[PDB]
């Protein structure tokens, strides 16, 4: 089983299985905590049990490891990965990391990795061979981003605009000087979905602040 | 074997023209693929736009200096063969413009810079009077073997790509683009 459709599913799936396992409450307590009785329920039976998330390292390398689907909480269904898994696979803050999970014994409360088999959808050794992002050299924007879907909608209109106001370009940096109420919600959602339907090859993350 | 050096240099540069004109009538024929084809991504057209760009300045240049070569590679052969022959048979021609260069030999540098124009228009009206023949003229035999292969004009081609002109920064940010380009194929 994989945490991230359990995630991902919505309190259908916790009465569900509510009804189905015979817990003896579901209701009133956090998502976190109920994603983690039911996962503790189900590997109790001893069934191999998947995880993927990302990785971190803290002051002491103490690892742990998260989910985006959750944005980052610290909550009880963070992944633990020992010191020694870091020391002896080279994996850094930020790694993509998919792997078996081992349910917790007496002393410990989270769960911990057993293996691994995909480091940033790679294969695990192959990731240790791999050139660090600052010591590579920068170089100017080459690329073309266009905001131009071509379909013709009400906010392509829009994206036309900003296709005549200011070219896009791979690996660029942009900065938006937005007063409120000026509508930058519109063109922000327009940029998402410019980004994700004239280029699906790149892959897109957007980050949101209070 | 001076001529016969710059031939050389004047064939390997049209040779060389005539590869990246290849490599450009593949981009156009790719180019004309991808449009009539399933063109969602816009990125790849986008560089498909910069290389034809900067495929089309480098045939440019490539004209250009293919017609510089040219022209020297004709005018090293027309002064080598003229002053052989000129050393050859020159008295008569001497005497027959003795006064013109006379006049220039043992005066002032105003009389100099005067007697060329006289002998400037005298030449002029005896090559008028004599081409109203028309009849035509084969090369020197010395020469005439590689002068056909190049011919007295250069390629129609050279020539329609010659039309447009480029300022130096244009000039500069294309050669720009060929060093990126190159950069590009380098990986």
Not at chain 1, 14 to 42: C, P, S, V, W, Y
Not at chain 1, 49 to 75: C, K, N, T, W
Request: some cysteine; aromatic content about 6%; glycine content about 6%.
């Amino acid at each position: 089983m994989n945490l991230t459709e359990l995630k991902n599913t919505p309190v259908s799936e916790l009465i569900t299985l509510g009804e189905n396992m015979g817990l003896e409450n579901l209701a009133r307590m956090r998502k976190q905590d109920i994603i983690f009785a039911i996962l503790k329920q189900h590997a109790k039976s001893g069934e191999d049990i998947f995880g993927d998330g990302v990785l971190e390292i803290l002051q002491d390398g103490f690892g742990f490891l998260r989910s985006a689907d959750s944005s980052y909480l610290a909550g009880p269904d963070d992944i633990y990965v020992s010191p020694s898994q870091i020391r002896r696979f080279n994996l850094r803050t930020g790694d993509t990391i998919s792997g078996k999970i081992r349910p917790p014994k007496e002393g410990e409360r989270y769960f911990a990795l057993l293996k691994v088999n995909e480091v940033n959808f790679d294969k695990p050794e192959n990731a240790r061979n791999k050139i660090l992002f600052e010591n590579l050299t920068p170089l100017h924007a080459n690329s073309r981003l266009r905001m131009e879907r071509g379909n013709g909608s009400t906010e392509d209109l829009t994206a036309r605009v900003l296709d005549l106001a200011s070219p896009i370009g791979r690996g660029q940096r942009g900065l938006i000087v937005a007063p409120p109420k000026a509508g930058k919600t519109m063109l922000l959602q327009n940029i998402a979905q410019s980004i994700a339907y004239n280029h699906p090859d790149c892959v897109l993350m957007v980050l949101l602040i209070d | 074997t001076a001529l016969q050096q710059a031939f050389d240099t004047c064939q390997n540069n049209k040779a060389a023209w005539l590869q990246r004109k290849n490599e450009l009538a593949a981009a156009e024929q790719e180019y004309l693929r991808l449009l009539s084809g399933e063109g969602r991504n816009v990125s790849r057209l986008d560089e498909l736009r910069n290389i034809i760009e900067v495929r089309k300045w480098q045939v440019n240049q490539a004209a250009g200096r293919y017609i510089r070569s040219h022209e020297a590679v004709q005018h090293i052969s027309i002064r080598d063969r003229l002053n052989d022959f000129m050393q050859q048979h020159g008295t008569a021609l001497a005497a027959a413009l003795a006064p013109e260069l006379m006049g220039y030999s043992e005066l002032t540098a105003i009389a100099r810079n005067c007697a060329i124009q006289r002998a400037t228009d005298a030449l002029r009206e005896a090559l008028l009077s004599w081409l109203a023949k028309g009849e035509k003229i084969n090369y020197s035999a010395q020469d005439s073997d590689i002068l056909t292969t190049i011919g007295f004009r250069p390629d129609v081609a050279s020539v329609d790509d010659s039309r447009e002109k480029f300022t130096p920064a244009q000039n500069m940010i294309f050669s720009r683009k060929s060093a990126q380009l190159a950069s590009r194929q380098s990986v």
